[PDB]
């Protein structure tokens, strides 16, 4: 029935408000210029970088950076965990599943909402304090000039499809209940719930967008993309372990990476 | 008036059994033995307990009171489940929804286990099993005294004879008190409670009339369980000191 889809759209919406406090919508607000949020403080070269731990709550700088982005990533899981634990039926599967779900549809997650923190020219940064450059970020040492570029590419394409936050709450479901990762147990229960799922999205963008034709297997066609941007990341990750074995990676991301 | 407190009355009791699997009536068979239909394997001593994860699917103390915690998680989905269908619980400021449940889903979550408990033990699993409470006082510190003080509270709860009807209101009481720190608009909760309340008295004095001042009685008993609560949190401090970095994050 129609009516038991759209209850769950809306109960999905409901907990991605409550566990996620930078919406893609006051994303937007912020990177346009509406008077519902204030001005972000942009950084785009190492004097702004150093004004900005005065003004917008916060070693090579480039590594600096990364341990900010890395902090952040952490804060991110954190939150995507406490969305999961709504998804109807997650927390009934097996316990050892629930954490493969979460260890692999983490950063595929991760990377989609960052788009919500992305346009052409950039990434909202510090809960929407900071706007840091994709100009300043590609400028930055030979391992690193390389990290956030081809999050810009994707988040480019994705934006394009024009989702709203509560699309994007049904979509990030159907990332997490995949079925198709690598150790699960039982993947039957998870296929169940993500047909659920997918149901659910089918309808809610023929409704938020119905003159967007074939929106539906335009989305589900982008988990190509995050699939292949998850793989350069971690090799890339590797990489910087042996540059800078002075540097420490944080042990739940750590659990996260299982080469 | 009393037509609409008897059809609020029944509109949560509808609900409470469609986000509860496992109803009082439904378990209260299964420890008096009457439904003999199904008979729930029992964890008397240790051995039972290894032949237990054969039957039932699912160090020996620590496995426990961590299959302890997997269900609470559960629960908590039910019950917020539950709390949504609470007239104008979803109206209310999205912080205000978040905070009645962080705060009202543990006392919620003993007194439904108390539904689960008879003096002996409790049904684990759905009802497919049934722990002994000899099994629970076995077990190391501070682990043995982890279930003792709930046992203690489930029989004098369980002493008011309630039913899944009563329960239903009870509960839904629970979760809107407008006194969980950090609320911001308190007036549409105390709102609800208050209609929640006289929705309970009735239901308590038609359901239970040669039962005296069982209003009185069940009001008196939230005060054990904000004391049980208090109690529960700070033995998961000393545990916090006894004792997958995913799966701590799961576990909040
Ligand atoms: O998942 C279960 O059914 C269960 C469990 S899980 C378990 C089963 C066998 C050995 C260890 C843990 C449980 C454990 C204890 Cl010490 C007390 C009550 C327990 N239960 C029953 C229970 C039902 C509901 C809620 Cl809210 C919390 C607990
Ligand atoms: O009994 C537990 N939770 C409740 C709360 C309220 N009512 C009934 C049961 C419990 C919780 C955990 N845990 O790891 O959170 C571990 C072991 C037992």
Same mark, same amino acid.
């Given at each position: 029935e129609s009516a038991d889809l759209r209850a769950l759209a809306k109960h999905l919406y409901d907990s991605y408000i409550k566990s996620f406090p930078l919406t893609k919508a006051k994303a937007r607000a912020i990177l346009t210029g509406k008077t519902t949020d204030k001005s972000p403080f942009v950084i785009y070269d190492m004097n702004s970088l150093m004004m900005g731990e005065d003004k917008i709550k916060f070693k090579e700088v480039a590594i600096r950076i990364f341990q900010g982005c890395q902090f952040r990533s952490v804060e991110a899981v954190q939150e995507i965990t406490e969305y999961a634990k709504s998804i109807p039926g997650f927390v009934n599967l097996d316990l050892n599943d629930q954490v493969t779900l979460l260890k692999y549809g983490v950063h595929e997650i991760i990377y989609t909402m960052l788009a919500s923190l992305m346009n052409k020219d950039g990434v909202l940064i510090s809960e929407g304090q900071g706007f840091m450059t994709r100009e300043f970020l590609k400028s930055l040492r030979k391992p690193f000039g390389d990290f956030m570029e081809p999050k810009f590419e994707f988040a480019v394409k994705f934006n394009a499809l024009e989702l709203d936050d509560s699309d994007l709450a049904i979509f990030i479901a159907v990332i997490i209940l995949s079925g198709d990762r690598p150790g699960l147990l039982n993947v039957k229960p998870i296929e169940d719930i993500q047909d659920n799922l997918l149901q659910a999205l089918e309808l809610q963008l023929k409704l938020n967008?119905?003159? /967007? /034709?074939?929106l539906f297997a335009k989305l589900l066609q982008k988990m190509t993309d995050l699939r292949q941007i998850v793989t350069e990341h971690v090799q890339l990750l590797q990489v910087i372990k042996k540059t800078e074995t002075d540097m420490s990676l944080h042990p739940l991301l750590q659990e996260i990476y299982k080469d």
């Open positions: 967008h119905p003159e /967007s /034709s074939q």
